[PDB]
Amino acid sequence: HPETLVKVKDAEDQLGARVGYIELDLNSGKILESFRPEERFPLTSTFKVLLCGAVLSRVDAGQEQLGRRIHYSQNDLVEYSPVTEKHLTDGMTVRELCSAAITMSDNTAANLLLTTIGGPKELTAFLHNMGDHVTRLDRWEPELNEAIPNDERDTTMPAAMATTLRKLLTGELLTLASRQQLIDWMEADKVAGPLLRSALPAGWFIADKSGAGERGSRGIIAALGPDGKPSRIVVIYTTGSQATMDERNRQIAEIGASLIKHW
Ligand SMILES: [Cl-]
């Protein structure tokens, strides 16, 4: 709906910074609405979903096992590791790392998973290898969150991220089992409350991943829809703003309410 873009433009005005927006049909992949679809923004923690899509693709290919256990040490823990910091003794399985990376945005869990696939370069190669020549991961947690203005390291564009997410949730890229696990982890997201979830009416489905970093960077990727099933993908990114976190959350929640109102 073109009225949703009026709210997207208003978010830009309120944040004093760029906002990129894409709403996609889940079934056809068609772009329904877009704003700055081809401009780069920092991935921050939204890359965690792409990381576990690359992990799941290796599982599908018999090179990795969801039940494999990894052990690690205090020297591996970086900031914002609420789950991994609790399992130093027992270690965690690849499945439990993905869960922590997606549902809790656990940073050491992302680094551990990155090491399983050969680092940021290999994530970028996975994305390159599934048709996405835009999205790129260059660094590890936490430095990937730096959001230096005009730096293309650790960035995507709203349209590239939206079509990639759709290919991960729907294509024959991944087996049914893998596609269902990725979305089930997204649906279990615990750290994106004040964004699209705060505008979502009772009974609607949402599977999302949010991100926050430095210099006002903030974003969210989602599969959502009425009647307890996803029917659309939405991607929202912003960076640069000096507005506080509460105000960035509110602008994204208001984009979400406007999208719902105009569904
Ligand atoms: Cl490993």
Residue numbers in the entry: 26 to 238, 240 to 252, 254 to 290
Source paper text:
Among 32 natural variants of TEM-1 characterized to date for substitutions at position 68 and 69, Met68 can be mutated to Ile and Met69 to Ile/Leu/Val; the substitutions Met68Leu and the Met69Thr in the engineered cTEM-2m and cTEM-19m do not have natural counterparts. The inclusion of 17 substitutions left cTEM-17m essentially unaltered relative to TEM-1, but inclusion of the substitutions Met68Leu/Met69Thr in cTEM-2m and cTEM-19m dropped kcat 1 to 3 orders of magnitude, to levels similar to PSE-4. Among the 26 dynamic residues in cTEM-2m, we find 7 of the 11 dynamic residues of TEM-1. Thus, the slow motions of TEM-1 were generally maintained while additional residues acquired ms conformational exchange. Dynamic residues in cTEM-2m border and extend throughout the active-site wall 234–244 (Ile231, Lys234, Gly238 and residues 241–246), while TEM-1 showed a single dynamic residue there (Arg241).
The system of five interrelated, functional β-lactamases stems from the recombination of two homologs, the TEM-1 penicillinase and the PSE-4 carbenicillinase.
